[PDB]
Each structure stands twice: as structure tokens, then as C-alpha cells.
Amino acid sequence: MQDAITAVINASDVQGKYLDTAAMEKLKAYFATGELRVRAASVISANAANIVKEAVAKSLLYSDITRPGGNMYTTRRYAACIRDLDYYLRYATYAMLAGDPSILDERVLNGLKETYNSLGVPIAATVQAIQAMKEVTASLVGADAGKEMGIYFDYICSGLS
């Protein structure tokens, strides 16, 4: 993982240059966003189960996914799907805190598309579900940090696609 601080310093390190004044402006922006980000992370931390519950209701439930032979059918698979949605929520919140999508790329997206295609997981339903999570999360954490959570949720959607 690279957070915004680590990304700035590593970008400067690759060139070999000390932290420039422009890089300092980048770091200052991250520090400015820090309060709203930490507050939103605590909101998601306490309301994580409700976010998954609402999202699975909004999109996944009462569809062909949960009817017999639909892949979310069977209590084992319904449990597995809500587990994966909480994976996405936890890593997306990690990414909101850090400020960089490298957590998503390293810990979620790399290889997930292949495993999902192998297991037969519908990929359109996963994207629709995590977009539904974005709607719920925007409501809970507010628009300003909902702007932020959306960037990382969209990152996951694009990776799965």
C-alpha cells in the first residue's frame, strides 16, 4: 500500500529529488482532507453491516440471483456474497483513509476477476451491488466524503469489469 504521503515521497524518491514545494502542496492537501476522512471512516466502521444490508436489499435481493439456481441461492452462497460485499466496503474505507487506490489494486482487484469468472460469480450483479453500496454510503457519510468514497468504489467496479 501507498497512502498519499507515501506516494508523494516515493514519486520524489524515484527522481531522486528532495521533497519539492509542489509536492509539499500535495501533502498539505492530504493533511487538510484528513479530518473529514477520519470522521467518515468512523461512520462506515459503525454502520458497515447496515450498509451491506441496505445494498443487498436495494439490488441483489428479490431477483434471479437469489432464486434457485441463481448463484446467490443456498444459504452458503448468500453468506458468501454478503462477505464479499463487506470485503469491498472495508477495503474501500481503507482507501478513503489512505487517499490512494493502491490498497484496492494490491489487496482486492489483482486476480479477483479471474477467480470470479472461475467460480461463476455474476460480475454485473457485483458491480450493481457495489454501486448500490456507494449510494448508501453517500447517505451515511455525507456528500463531501461520499464524493471521496465514490472514487474508490468506482475503482473496484472498473477492476472487476
Binding site: 497512502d3 507515501t6 493533511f31 484528513g34 479530518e35 466502521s45 458497515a48 483513509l97
Partner: protein, 160 residues
Amino acid sequence: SVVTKSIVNADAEARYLSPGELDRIKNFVSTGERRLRIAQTLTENRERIVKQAGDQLFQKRPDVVSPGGNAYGEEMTATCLRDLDYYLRLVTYGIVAGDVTPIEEIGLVGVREMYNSLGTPIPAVAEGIRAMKNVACSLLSAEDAAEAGSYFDFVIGAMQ
């Protein structure tokens, strides 16, 4: 960084960030401006710090710069000074990050292997960074100098 340290540990525990860790990153973001100021003064005076501390290193251990030492001749002694410059840059990265994490990656891992194979005496390198720490202390205010002292101290401890 503090943020990465917290997230790595919590990710291993498969746990949304603990409330205390969230408070810790909140304190880090408040303290960030002071960290950036410390990095600003050190990087602005980087030429002074490296130059006079390098003079101190060679004065304290002339055998190191004497013929037969690793920094024997104009070329080799210049590269030794460049290594001192590298470690100042990494210390500025560590100060901004608020944790040794960047310095403990870019340097401080296998430094013993690299230098010992390079032929250099790593205790002498540690003395050079100590001299840089003294110069930086002169250029910093008392409380600010304590934190930068911590990052320099981590470097010299890894060297030893």
C-alpha cells in the same frame, strides 16, 4: 506513514480501523503542518548540513578518507558525500511521513549487506549521520529537533 501503519495492521486483523487508531491518524493530520515545516528547513539548508557534517566526518575519522580508505581520491570521497546527502533526503521523507516507514524501506534494509560488500566501514557511516544530526539540531528549534532527532537516531541505530 501513520496511516499506512494503522491500515496494514488492521488489514491483517481483518478489522475496520480501531477507534484508537482513527484518533491516532487524526492527531497525525493535525501535526502534519509542523512535520512539513521541519522538512522544509532541513531541505532548504541541505547543502549546509551535508557539507559541514561531511567535513566533521572526515575530520573525526581521517583514516576513512586517507589513501587506502574507501573514500580515497576525489571521485570516491565525492560519492561518500553523496551517500550522506541520500540519507538526509530519506530523513526528510521520514519526517513528512511521521514514521520511519519510508526511510526503513528506501534505505536501512540490507545497508549492512550493501556497505559491507562495498568495503566501507558502516560504523564510520553511522558517525557521519551523527554529525548530520548535530548540525540539524543546531538548525532546529528544541521540540522540533527532538522529532527529527528521532528519525536520525533510527538511521544511526540501524547503521550500528
